[PDB]
Amino acid sequence: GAMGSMERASLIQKAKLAEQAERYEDMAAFMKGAVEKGEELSCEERNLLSVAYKNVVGGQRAAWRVLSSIEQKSNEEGSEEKGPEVREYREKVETELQGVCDTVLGLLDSHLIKEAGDAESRVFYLKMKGDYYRYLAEVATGDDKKRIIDSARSAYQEAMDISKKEMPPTNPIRLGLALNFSVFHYEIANSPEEAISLAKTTFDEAMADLHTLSEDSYKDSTLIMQLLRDNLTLWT
């Protein structure tokens, strides 16, 4: 890769600079280079990796949705033929999004996940794996769509099993995992009841564990609990 000649520490420093500059494509390339150095990632380094790619794919997903909406209106009854351009350009963005998801999944598979032994790292990477298969599932339509969905489900499920055994109910990674798995249930798996049950149980068990936390940990946990509550308000 093009980052093979840069020091690991310099890649990390520049990823932090790119975040300050809101240059998320650069940030993702720097963190990909840092991963490819082959050493495990620290807690802060895992966050940098996640933030970088979440922003990149987030822009791609927002663009894909704009274009998919235009395409669907064009294929309505009474619409004028505009030619192949809207489909072509949606496919363009879709292919670029899939390429980014494949890149992240490749980093997790080679070899972040197999070297991650602590609950905090292993759950973090498995949550990421579920998320990026979820993003692939959002655009999937072919022979493999069901397999993509099950790959997301399987990664989320393994992360959940570990987090329930190894982490307190208020752990922010455990909470964010449950939040995203509930969104998977609602948006991808057509299981809104499973989504609601998971969000409620996650919220109630975190509520009952708040008394054990410092003021700073309380702030971290209650922030994500409010996202669970926001979804429950939208879903019920």
Partner: peptide, 9 residues
Amino acid sequence: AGSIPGRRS
């Protein structure tokens, strides 16, 4: 339905 925004830090 919101996932972890996860866009900062």
